[PDB]
C-alpha cells in the first residue's frame, strides 16, 4: 500500500499519471453529483465513457509502476513487457472508443435526446480544458523500459479532444454531428495504427526494425571469422524498447578457437545494438 | 484470395471458424431484414479464424520465429473483447432498467441460443504444434453468448431483474475469461512457462553436476505459441572442459524437461 505512493513519487510520468487519475476521479464525483438529477440521459453516457478513460490511464499507470520491478524465477526478464502490453491495450481501448463514438453519433442522428438545459455544454468546455492541460503536460516530441507508456495516453488524450470538439460541432450545427463522429473516429484510428503495428511487432517476436537492416552485414562478418563453418538458427527479437535479445548457433572447425570466435561474435553483435546475446558454438565432426 | 479457402479447408479448426462466420453473416442479413453487439462478435471469431490462418505461415527474416504468437494475441484480444462486451452489457442493462415493440416477441433469440448450443457442442475440446489458444477463446466466447441469451428470457420470465441478470452474466463471464487473460499475459511477458518452472531447479542442479561446469547463469526460459518453450543459458566451464560433452548433456537435460529450442553458451574460465 504505502510503498506504492513511494513508488508513485519516484517517476515524473508516474506522478503525472496519478495527478491525471485523481483529476478524472474528481470529475467522476462532480459528474455523478450532476447526474443524480433528471438530466442523467447523456450524463451517464459520458460517465461510462470517462470511466473507460480512467481504466485506460489506470492501466498505463499500473504498467509504469510495474515495469521497474526486479526479476524473479517466474519473470526471468523482469516486468519490462508491461510497457508494451500497456501500449497495445491502450490502442485497443482507442479502437473500441472509436466504435463507441460511432454508435453515439448514430443515436444522436436518429433519436432526439434533447431533454436538457445544456449543462453538458459547459462541462464539455471543462473536458476540453482538461484535454489541453494534458496535451501540454504530456508533450514528449535489463533496464530502460520506458518508451511506449507516453504514446498510448497521448494518443488517448488526442482522441478525448476530438470527442470533446464533436459536441462543439454538434452545437454549431443545431445553432451534422454523425459526420463529425465519422471524421474523428477515422482520424484517431489512423493515428492509432502505428502504435498497434509496433506493439504487434514487438509482441510477436519479430526482428527489431532498427536491427533488421544490420543483420545481413553482421552474419557476413561472423561468417568471415576464422574457422566458422556455418551460421544457423538466428533469432533476434525486441524486449521492451531498446533491448534486443539475440540467439545464435555457430558450427565451427573441429579445432577452432572457440574463445576468440565467441568474443568476436559478441563484439560484432554488440556493435549492432544487441545487448543480450547467446552464441552456441558447435564443433563440427571433420 | 483463392489460396485462403484452401488453407481454411486444410486446417480443421479453420474449417469450423469459416462456416460459423457464415451463420452470423446470414443471421446479420435476417436481423437487418427484420430491422427495416453481434457484429462485434463477428469481429472476435474473425480474429480467431485469422489467427488460425496466419499461424502456420513460413518463417522469414523479419519474423524469425514464424507467426505463432498470433494465437496468443488472438486469445488476449478475445479476452479484452469479452471484458468490454461485459462492461457494455452492464451499460445496456442499465439503459434497459431505466427505459417494448415486441416484433416476433424476440423468439429469434431462442434459435440463437440453439446456435450457441450447436457451437458449444462443436467447439467442445476438453516451430510447430501451433494450436491450443483459439479453442479456449471461442469456447468462453460462446459461453458468454449463451449467458447473454439467458439474459433476455430471464427478462421474459420476470415480465410474465434484467439489470440484475446482466450483472450476473457480466461478472460470471469476466470470471470465466480471467484464466485465459492470465495465461496470455504470462506468455506475452516472457514469463517462465508454468509447466516448466517446477522442473527448472532440478535441471539447474543436474547441469551443475556435469563434469567441469563452474557456474551457471543468465537462464531465461519463455513460451513460444503454446507447447514450444525457448531457453537460453550461459555456462562457465573449466579451461579444459569437454565442451562437446557438456553441450550434449545440457541439451539432453533441458530437452527431457520440455524445452524445444535451447541455446547454451559455454565460456571457458581463466583458471
Amino acid at each position, epitope marked *: 500500500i504505502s510503498g506504492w505512493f513511494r513508488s508513485i513519487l519516484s517517476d515524473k510520468t508516474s506522478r503525472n499519471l496519478f495527478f491525471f487519475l485523481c483529476l478524472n476521479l474528481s470529475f467522476a464525483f462532480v459528474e455523478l453529483l450532476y447526474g443524480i438529477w433528471s438530466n442523467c440521459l447523456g450524463l451517464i453516457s459520458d460517465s461510462f465513457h470517462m470511466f473507460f478513460d480512467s481504466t485506460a490511464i489506470l492501466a498505463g499507470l499500473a504498467a509504469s509502476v510495474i515495469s521497474k520491478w526486479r526479476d524473479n524465477d517466474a519473470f526471468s526478464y523482469g516486468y519490462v513487457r508491461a510497457e508494451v502490453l500497456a501500449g497495445f491495450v491502450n490502442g485497443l481501448f482507442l479502437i473500441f472508443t472509436a466504435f463507441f463514438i460511432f454508435s453515439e453519433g448514430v443515436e444522436r442522428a436518429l433519436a432526439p435526446p434533447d431533454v436538457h438545459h445544456e449543462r453538458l455544454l459547459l462541462v464539455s468546455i471543462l473536458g476540453f480544458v482538461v484535454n489541453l492541460i494534458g496535451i501540454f503536460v504530456f508533450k514528449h516530441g535489463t533496464t530502460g523500459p520506458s518508451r511506449q507508456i507516453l504514446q498510448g495516453v497521448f494518443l488517448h488524450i488526442l482522441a478525448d479532444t476530438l470527442g470533446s470538439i464533436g459536441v462543439i460541432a454538434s452545437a454549431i450545427m443545431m445553432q451534422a454531428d454523425p459526420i463529425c463522429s465519422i471524421l474523428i473516429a477515422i482520424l484517431i484510428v489512423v493515428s492509432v495504427i502505428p502504435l498497434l503495428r509496433e506493439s504487434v511487432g514487438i509482441l510477436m517476436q519479430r526482428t527489431p526494425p532498427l536491427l533488421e537492416n544490420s543483420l545481413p552485414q553482421c552474419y557476413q562478418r561472423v561468417q*568471415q571469422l*576464422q574457422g566458422v*563453418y556455418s551460421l544457423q538458427e538466428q533469432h533476434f527479437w525486441t524486449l521492451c524498447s531498446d533491448v534486443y535479445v539475440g540467439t545464435l548457433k555457430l558450427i565451427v*572447425a*573441429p*579445432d*577452432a578457437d572457440a*574463445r*576468440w570466435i565467441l568474443s568476436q561474435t559478441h563484439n560484432i553483435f554488440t556493435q549492432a545494438g544487441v545487448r543480450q546475446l547467446y552464441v552456441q558454438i558447435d564443433f563440427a565432426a571433420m | 484470395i483463392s489460396g485462403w479457402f484452401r488453407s481454411i479447408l486444410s486446417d480443421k479448426t479453420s474449417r469450423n471458424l469459416f462456416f460459423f462466420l457464415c451463420l452470423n453473416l446470414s443471421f446479420a442479413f435476417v436481423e437487418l431484414l427484420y430491422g427495416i453487439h453481434m457484429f462485434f462478435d463477428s469481429t472476435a471469431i474473425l480474429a480467431g479464424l485469422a489467427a488460425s490462418v496466419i499461424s502456420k505461415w513460413r518463417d522469414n527474416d523479419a519474423f524469425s520465429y514464424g507467426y505463432v504468437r498470433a494465437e496468443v494475441l488472438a486469445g488476449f484480444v478475445n479476452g479484452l473483447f469479452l471484458i468490454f462486451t461485459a462492461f457494455f452489457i452492464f451499460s445496456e442493462g442499465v439503459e434497459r432498467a431505466l427505459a417494448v415493440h415486441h416484433e416476433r416477441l424476440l423468439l429469434v433469440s431462442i434459435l440463437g441460443f440453439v446456435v450457441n448450443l450447436i457451437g458449444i457442442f462443436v467447439f467442445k475440446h476438453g516451430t510447430t504444434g501451433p494450436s491450443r489458444q483459439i479453442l479456449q477463446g471461442v469456447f468462453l466466447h460462446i459461453l458468454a453468448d449463451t449467458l447473454g441469451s439467458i439474459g433476455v428470457i430471464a427478462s421474459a420470465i420476470m415480465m410474465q431483474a434484467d439489470p440484475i441478470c446482466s450483472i450476473l452474466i457480466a461478472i460470471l463471464i469476466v470470471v470465466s475469461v480471467i484464466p485465459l487473460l492470465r495465461e496470455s499475459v504470462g506468455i506475452l511477458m516472457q514469463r517462465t512457462p508454468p509447466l516448466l518452472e517446477n522442473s527448472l531447479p532440478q535441471c539447474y542442479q543436474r547441469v551443475q553436476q556435469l563434469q567441469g561446469v563452474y557456474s551457471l547463469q543468465e537462464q531465461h526460459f519463455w513460451t513460444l505459441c503454446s507447447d514450444v518453450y525457448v531457453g537460453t543459458l550461459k555456462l562457465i566451464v573449466a579451461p579444459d572442459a569437454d565442451a562437446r560433452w557438456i553441450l550434449s548433456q545440457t541439451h539432453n537435460i533441458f530437452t527431457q524437461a520440455g524445452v524445444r529450442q535451447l541455446y547454451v553458451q559455454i565460456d*571457458f574460465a581463466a583458471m
Partner: antibody
Amino acid sequence: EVQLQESGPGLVAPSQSLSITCTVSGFSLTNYAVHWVRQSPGKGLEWLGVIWSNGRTDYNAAFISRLSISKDNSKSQVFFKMNSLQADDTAIYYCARKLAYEGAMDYWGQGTSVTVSS
Amino acid sequence: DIVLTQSPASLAVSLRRRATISCRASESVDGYGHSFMHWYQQKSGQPPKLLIYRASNLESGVPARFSGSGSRTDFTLTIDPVEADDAATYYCQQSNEDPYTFGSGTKLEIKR
C-alpha cells in the same frame, strides 16, 4: 611423432609460380588446420594463410589475389601455390600445424628456402 | 592490421639472471577476459617454437622457467633463470584480428 615436411623448388625465376607441398604425419588433416608462414630478413615473420579441416581457407589480405592453398586428406598433403613471384618473396616458407582450440601454431616444419632470381 | 613492437630489439643477460621481453600492440588483442597474444622462440636455424599461448599459458613440454604476463596492449615474456640454451630470437604473435601479425624479434644474448 608429429612431422611436417615441405618440398619445394629452391630457385624460382621472377614472375612465375611457386608450388610447395607440405606432407604431414602424426596427425590427421580432417581435424587439424595447417597455417602457412614465411620468414625473410627484410619482413621478419609474415602470415600467408590457413586451410581448415573442411577445406575452408583464409588468406592474408595483401596476398589474396596471388595465393592459393589446397589440401587432400587421403595422402595427408597440403599444397601451397603462389603466383607472380618477385624478389620480395625470397623467404623461408613454413607449414605449421595449428594449435588446437587456440590461435597459435605449435608444431612447425623445417622451412624451405625459396629464392627468386634470374 | 595490428602492429607489434618489441623492446629492446636486442637484450644481453648473464647466466642465472632475469630476462624481460616486452611486446607492444597498436590495438588491444584482448577479448572477454582472454588476451590472444602468443610467444614464439626461434633459435639458430630451426623454425620458431611455441612457448606461451594466450599470453599466460605455458605450452606443454617447455621448461617452467619461461613466464608470460600482461593484458590489453602490454605483454611481457620473462625467462628466470636464464640458461645458455635460451640464446634465441623471441617473437610475439597476435591472433585477435585477421591477418595474423608477428612482432620484430628480440635477440637474447648470454653474457659470460
